[PDB]
Amino acid sequence: EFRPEMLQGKKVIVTGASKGIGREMAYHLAKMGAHVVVTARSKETLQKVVSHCLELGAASAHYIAGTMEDMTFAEQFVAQAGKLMGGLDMLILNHITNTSLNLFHDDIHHVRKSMEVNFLSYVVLTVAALPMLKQSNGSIVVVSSLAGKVAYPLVAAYSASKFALDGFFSSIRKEYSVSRVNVSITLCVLGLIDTETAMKAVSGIVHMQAAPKEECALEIIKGGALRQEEVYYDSSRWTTLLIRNPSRKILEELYSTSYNMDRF
Amino acid sequence: FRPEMLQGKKVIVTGASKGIGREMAYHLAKMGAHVVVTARSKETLQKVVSHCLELGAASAHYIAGTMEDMTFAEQFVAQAGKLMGGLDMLILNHITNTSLNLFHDDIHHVRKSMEVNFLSYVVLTVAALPMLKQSNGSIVVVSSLAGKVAYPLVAAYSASKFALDGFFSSIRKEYSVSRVNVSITLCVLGLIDTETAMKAVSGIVHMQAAPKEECALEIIKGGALRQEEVYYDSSRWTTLLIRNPSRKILEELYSTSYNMDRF
Ligand SMILES: NC(=O)c1ccc[n+]([C@@H]2O[C@H](COP(=O)([O-])OP(=O)(O)OC[C@H]3O[C@@H](n4cnc5c(N)ncnc54)[C@H](OP(=O)(O)O)[C@@H]3O)[C@@H](O)[C@H]2O)c1
Ligand SMILES: NC(=O)c1ccc[n+]([C@@H]2O[C@H](COP(=O)([O-])OP(=O)(O)OC[C@H]3O[C@@H](n4cnc5c(N)ncnc54)[C@H](OP(=O)(O)O)[C@@H]3O)[C@@H](O)[C@H]2O)c1
Ligand SMILES: O=C(N[C@@H]1[C@@H]2C[C@@H]3C[C@H]1C[C@@](O)(C3)C2)c1cnc(N[C@H]2CCOC2)nc1C1CCCC1
Ligand SMILES: O=C(N[C@@H]1[C@@H]2C[C@@H]3C[C@H]1C[C@@](O)(C3)C2)c1cnc(N[C@H]2CCOC2)nc1C1CCCC1
Known part of the structure; x- marks a missing residue:
């Protein structure tokens, strides 16, 4: 089904693209000959990514540095x-605020910052991108986690922000089908990935073999290009078998007609 | 469950000037609990305090303010x-005023929904936890079917309800490992016949709303019984599809996998 030609000449934004999965996605898109615009806070790191993207064969590559804590920057x-x-053509929302594993006590500012950066900025970027995505019948790719589908300790604020993305974007996807907005929304549910940030945060706490970041980056792009509603990617075969929620899908399909949306 | 379980219990009810919150304050009053009600309207809260006392509350007081203000919370x-x-019990029920609409560009409304429906619940939990630890108390979080499953017309509301599940379910795992003997009840409600809901839904939603009095009682029962989740919908079959067994399997399977000695 997927062919890398699907991305050739496509106009793609990748956020949180100075390192980890974001950087790998920029690299894959560059190899595919897409036009890329990368963002993160570090201009020096973004310059290195852009240059490597051009070397890899990107149709074009540019960066714009800034913080996703600022809604006006977004x-x-x-x-x-x-x-x-x-x-x-494609808006890849991947950035998060720096998060470490800890028991939650009273850090309200960290909860707020997680909500602003991991969630609110994605909504802001979507609003700003929607008119161009409507013109191109484009795609929104939302990078999430297993912690955004299931409960784990040590990631309360992070989990809240990832669950909020599912709630918001899944509701917006239903609205797009009724209002005939031909823009796909891909929610990416990732297990532990071997990024430098993840490996450092998890040491001595988590035993798990983390999935490779290069293949993860590719599966995200494939799902987005194929307009899949959800992409599941993890190293555990057991989580892979259990992560889907067919009963949620039945329940949503069941009540899709029960609404008189003529008013809207 | 028996109404005696709440006799003399010290309970906070937020968003208690009307709807489910007011009904919960009335049930708790009938049960002989001590209640502290909150909402923005002091005049409506005063009437709630008086009817609570007249229903047999051990004590009833109100504190008025907005949950947009974290320092107030x-x-x-x-x-x-x-x-x-x-x-003994913290019942988190308030939400910011919400209407049914397609999402366009109302960022202010998304932010306000996140602040009032979610952030304030976290703030109230942090402030309440020392006393709840002393009493081995309960946190009851009022959510919705729209906090478990996707529906159109409630994007910002659903995001805030999903966030509650993510946060409080993570905190519940942390409480079991750190031996914080405080229960957390997430209440997944279908459509309820509150005046707010009936007005918002008219001509759009063609389904029988469940009664608010029984809903209020089922929330209190679930909290008093320290249940992890309370499901209350006018249909028993949505109450069947709403459960997520594979999530529970996935969580229980991974509970041993963590090394907590760092904490
Ligand atoms: N790694 C995993 O195991 C794992 C598991 C599940 C999901 N994920 C999802 O995967 C995505 C990528 O994570 P990753 O591990 O690749 O992370 P990463 O390597 O730490 O990269 C974070 C990217 O975000 C940018 N960033 C941090 N703070 C920012 C801010 N305030 N504004 C703008 N950008 C900011 C960082 O750049 P600078 O600091 O210059 O800004 C960097 O580009 C997140 O959506 C994460 O939830 C990762
Ligand atoms: N009704 C339903 O069908 C339904 C379905 C699923 C879930 N629920 C959940 O049930 C709970 C109660 O809803 P309800 O239908 O009973 O709602 P309601 O009757 O509309 O009452 C909302 C309560 O919130 C208080 N409130 C609103 N804004 C506030 C603010 N900024 N600060 C403090 N308090 C504020 C309101 O008081 P004032 O405006 O004086 O402040 C009032 O006491 C919500 O968590 C809701 O999500 C309801
Ligand atoms: O999204 C996840 N991790 C992210 C990594 C590591 C941490 C926390 C977030 C944000 C980070 O920046 C920092 C990058 C993530 C993904 N999959 C799993 N599943 C399996 C792992 C253990 O068993 C389930 N767990 C996590 C967290 C690791 C501990 C609890 C949840
Ligand atoms: O939480 C829910 N409703 C609330 C009421 C009405 C509206 C929206 C929220 C917040 C309110 O303040 C305003 C109070 C809620 C609860 N159960 C259902 N499921 C049933 C609906 C149709 O089929 C199942 N649906 C809703 C929303 C009503 C339309 C789409 C979802």
Whole structure:
């Protein structure tokens, strides 16, 4: 079904692209000959990614540095990235605020910052991107986690933000089908991935073999390109078997008609 | 369950000036609990305090304020705790005013929903936890079917309800390992016949809303019984598809896998 030609000349934004999965996605897209606009806070790190993207064969590569704690930067970043590429086909929302494993006690500012960066900025970027995505019948790719489908200790604020993404984007996907907005939304449910950040955060706590970041990056892009509603990627075969929630899907399909959406 | 389980218990009910919150305050009052009610309207809260006393509450007080203010949420709990001489049950029920609409660009509404429906619940929990640890108390979190499954027209509301599940379910795992003997009840509600819900839903939703009085009682029962989740919908079959057994399997399987000696 997937062919790398599907990404050739496509106009793609990748957030949190200076390292980890984001950087690997920028690299895969570059190899595929897409036009890429990468973002993160570090201009020096983003420059290195852009240069490697050009070397890999990107149709074009640019960066715009800024913090996703600033909603006005998020809004302006999309307009600028859209002007740089002459449009937008795929919006890959991948960035998160720095998170470490800890028992929750009273760090309200960290809960708020997690909600603002991991969730609110994704909504802001979606609003700013939607008119161009509507023009191109494009795609929104939302990077989530197993911690955004199931409960784990030590990631309360992070988990809340990832569950919020599922709630918001899954509701918006239902709205897009009724309002005939031909923009796909891909929610990516990832297990532990071998990024430097993850390996460091998890040492001495988690035993798990982490999945490779290169293949993870590719599966995200494939799912988005194929307009899949959800992408599941983890190293455990058992979680893979159990993660799907067919009963949630039946329940949503059951009540899809029960609404008189003529008013909207 | 028996109404005696709540007699003399020290309970906070948020969003208690009307709807399910008010009904919970009335049930608790009938049971002889000490209640502290909150919402923004002092005049409506005063009427709630008077009817609670007239229903047989051991004590009833109100503190008015907005849950958009995190510092109010923090101070409200300290004050409610002083008024009752402790805390046994924290019922988190308030939400910001929400109507059915397609999402377009209302970022202010998304943020406000996250602050009031989610962040304030976290704030109130942090402020309440020392007293709840003393009494081996309970946190009851009022959610919705829209907090477990996706529906159109409630994007920001659903995000905030999903966030509650993510946060409080993670905190429940942490409490079991750190031996914090405080139960956490997540209440997954279907459509309830509150005046707010009936108005918001008219001509859009073609389904019988469940009664608010029974809903209020099922929330209290679930909390008093320290149940992890309370399901209450007018249909028994959504109450069948709403459960997520594979999630429970996935969580129980991985509970041993963690080394907590760092904590
Ligand atoms: N690694 C895993 O095991 C794992 C598991 C499940 C899901 N995920 C999802 O995978 C995505 C990528 O994680 P990853 O492990 O690759 O992370 P990473 O290697 O730590 O990268 C975080 C990316 O976010 C950018 N970032 C951090 N703070 C930011 C802010 N305030 N504004 C803008 N960008 C910011 C960082 O760049 P700078 O600091 O310059 O800003 C960097 O580009 C997250 O959505 C994560 O939830 C990862
Ligand atoms: N009704 C349903 O069908 C239904 C279905 C699923 C779940 N639920 C859950 O049930 C709970 C109660 O809903 P309900 O239908 O009973 O709602 P309601 O009757 O509309 O009452 C909302 C309560 O919230 C208080 N409130 C609103 N904004 C506030 C703010 N900024 N600060 C403090 N308090 C505020 C309101 O008081 P004032 O405005 O004076 O402040 C009032 O006491 C919500 O958690 C809701 O998500 C309801
Ligand atoms: O999203 C996940 N991890 C992320 C990594 C590591 C940490 C926490 C987040 C954000 C980070 O930046 C920091 C990057 C993540 C993904 N899959 C699993 N599943 C399996 C792992 C153990 O068994 C289930 N667990 C986690 C967290 C690791 C401990 C509890 C949940
Ligand atoms: O939490 C829910 N409703 C709330 C009521 C009505 C509205 C929206 C929220 C917040 C309110 O303040 C305003 C109070 C809620 C609860 N159960 C259902 N399932 C049933 C609906 C149709 O089929 C199943 N649906 C809703 C929403 C109503 C339409 C889409 C989802």
